[PDB]
Amino acid sequence: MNITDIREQFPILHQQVNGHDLVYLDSAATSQKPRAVIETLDKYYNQYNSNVHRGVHTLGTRATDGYEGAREKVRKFINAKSMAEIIFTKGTTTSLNMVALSYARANLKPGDEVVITYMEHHANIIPWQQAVKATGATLKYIPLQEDGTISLEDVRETVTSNTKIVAVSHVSNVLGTVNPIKEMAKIAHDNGAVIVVDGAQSTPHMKIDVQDLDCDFFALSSHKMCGPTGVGVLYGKKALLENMEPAEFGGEMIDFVGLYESTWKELPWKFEAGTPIIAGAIGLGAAIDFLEEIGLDEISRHEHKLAAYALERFRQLDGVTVYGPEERAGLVTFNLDDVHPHDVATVLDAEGIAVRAGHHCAQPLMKWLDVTATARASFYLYNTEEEIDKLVEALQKTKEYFTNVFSGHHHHH
Amino acid sequence: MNITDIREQFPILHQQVNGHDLVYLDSAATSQKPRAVIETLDKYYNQYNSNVHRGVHTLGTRATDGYEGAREKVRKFINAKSMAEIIFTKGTTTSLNMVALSYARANLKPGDEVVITYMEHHANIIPWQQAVKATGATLKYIPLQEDGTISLEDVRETVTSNTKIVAVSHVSNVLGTVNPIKEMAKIAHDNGAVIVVDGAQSTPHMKIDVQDLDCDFFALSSHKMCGPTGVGVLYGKKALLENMEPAEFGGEMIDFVGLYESTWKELPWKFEAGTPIIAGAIGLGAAIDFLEEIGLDEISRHEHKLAAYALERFRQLDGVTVYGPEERAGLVTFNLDDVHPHDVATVLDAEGIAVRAGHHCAQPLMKWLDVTATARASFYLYNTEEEIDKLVEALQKTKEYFTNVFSGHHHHH
Ligand SMILES: *Cc1c(COP(=O)(O)O)cnc(C)c1O
Ligand SMILES: *Cc1c(COP(=O)(O)O)cnc(C)c1O
């Protein structure tokens, strides 16, 4: 856990922006990669790239063993029962779409309900909007408490015997809320519904055990957990996946192809059409190895300390609003009084500090918060308390700068 | 074009398999990558990885400029009119599925026809099987001539005023046939149909000009053209894409998101849901730069010479059947009399030689050929006449080996 030694493994952190040391606080948008991951990609392309299938030629066997070896690493990492339940996809968004297309569009009829929350990312809203439209079903929202948490009483109220799907984020990328997924799964199941978990913001930062959560589906993205871009995972309980039709069709996912009719491969390959994301999946396996070596519990404890420190330091600033609860993941979404968050991000980037401004792909949540946009600083395993000091110092300077501009302007005119 | 200097750029070629120099003749399954591409990925992750959108922070702007810069490289490379017509996808298979989902399922009714050919890869068969099933339309096949080419008279016969979609490979990955796509497009259009071109095997090997072809849709894969795995392109004429609904939904592809209804971004981003395939797309741009520097006409001429040499040398072998026409792309699919092609591939890999055996994702074509499987050697810009000499020498040895085993066995028993 020596943080200097961790940071030494991430080449991208060692540079300057606008003549200042880079302070990267946008890991919730995408994470940075250690040498172990980057070198895994290089070794792949330098030494054993080939299309998959064993029993053909040597490099082909190496590539296949790498690819399927990564599938097993994923299985172990989330504690799934079987590799049949681990599907490689392009990312969380594609994973959630696959569930909406192959499960929801097949199992919803008029009168059935899909239940989501106001804090969902767009990836876990729009596929369900489309699925309910296609089927004549109903979309419903679980309300939030005043601090941006979900009460289990509101879940019990909203979920009914007509509910077929409950879809929810494990962790919000805006509020930092950790939702009570295990308890929500029980409520879903008691009502005859499945639960679909958007795990994009939880997987990088805390241990996932899908057997303990009892989630029916779980989606994650490589690029948020030190892995390559363009790859993700869909986990689904084997019994559900066995009864779902493929979302995409082509080579690799078939068994027999006739002129008019075809039959599908067994799981997981039923859901993997075309040449797979070979290098990316292998690289994601390397990210998992890297994270496990540090320890996800160790990473969670570091983030708990960074979050506590940030919240305290933000409370030292006058004229700053922080959104969400005290108990949270490693991020802070905020606004400065009388400064647009896009201007905050601009001024901070001039100091080397990378944060994000906008709606963070959660427009319904922005409306619930009664704002159009916010600024967000997000932390990961390579971030330090010194970086949070720099952030809060820069925010104080930003307030002073805009105050002076306002007074200069009012005096003129 | 010095071939030694070209080969020097591909680190993977400089190794031994089973104590023999590697002879990689499976580029039709996947291509190998030059240092220029591999180093592009490394630079990305080492220096400017961030999620996309300009106007936020410095690395974010660099990443976005890289990503959108690659889109323009693609546009130029295939001579599309606009970047609005260039969509990044996971690969050819996903591209073809997107057309089947968003165009075919929206424009087909009972009585309408989708017309394909017996030589199509599964990626360009199964999505249409599913689309016709979903809509009550009819799937029809254009017959092949005796040498595995398509006659334009058969296309005129098969395509009718009820035909809405003609889908065809530019180049067959089994026969090596180059199909007359420009003339087929005219026949499609005259009948009121669109044409969908599977360009996975043409793009790596010959110049593509979509304005000259007049194709409505064109799909390609990065991994076959010296680029990263997990990325491809869908080209579509802007007027068609404007009227098609998205195939996947989420962040990045929206403009406004309400509780129940959402509106979409303009092209091309309408069709790119979620965090994009950032590194892969940038790497594909580097592959395009690399190929353009060598020259695609130069690559086509090299492959024409390799194909001519291979066909001549195969005709020197007794007891070998080659499938397809004399005028062809850079590949040879074949069978040895009385030797299963899987055994051919196994014996060749013991000599360092990588070829592929099976159905090559073209089961209907195997049936048309009256075989269950075949062996395939395929060539690209880093392959030489010496490698073809090694292949034919190994095939002669294979025939002699199996003949001796057969005689040994018959004498015993
Ligand atoms: C490889 C290939 C495909 C499939 O492409 P993927 O990259 O596997 O999606 C489709 N058509 C042809 C002609 C090919 O050679
Ligand atoms: C980033 C994120 C997503 C979207 O994931 P992509 O990798 O962009 O597909 C979904 N949900 C949450 C909670 C996220 O943080």
Author numbering:
A (entry chain A), B (entry chain A): 1 to 413
What text does the study give?
In all of these systems, the Fe-S cluster is formed on a scaffold protein before it is transferred to a target apoprotein. A cysteine desulfurase acquires sulfur from cysteine in a pyrodoxal-5ʹ-phosphate (PLP)-dependent reaction and then transfers it as persulfide to the scaffold protein. However, only the product of the sufS gene is involved in biosynthesis of Fe-S clusters. BsSufS assumes a type I fold of the aminotransferase class V family, consisting of an overall α/β fold that is highly similar to that of E. coli SufS, IscS, NifS, and CsdA.
We were able to determine the crystal structure of the BsSufS dimer to 1.7 Å resolution, revealing high structural homology to its E. coli counterpart. One molecule of SufS was found within the asymmetric unit (AU) and could be built to completeness. The BsSufS monomer forms a tightly intertwined homodimer with another monomer across the crystallographic symmetry axis. The interface and architecture of the BsSufS homodimer closely resemble those of E. coli SufS. The enzyme consists of two domains: A large, N-terminal domain (residues 1–294) and a smaller, C-terminal domain (residues 295–406). In the N-terminal domain, a 7-stranded, parallel β-sheet is sandwiched between several α-helices to form a tightly packed core. This domain harbors the active site pocket, where the cofactor PLP is bound to Lys224 as an aldimine. Furthermore, residues 253–265 (herein referred to as the ‘β-hook’) form a hairpin-like structure that latches on to the other monomer. The small, C-terminal domain consists of a 4-stranded, parallel β-sheet and four α-helices containing the flexible ‘Cys361-loop’ with the nucleophile Cys361. We found BsSufS in the product-bound state, with alanine bound near Cys361-persulfide, suggesting that one reaction cycle had occurred.
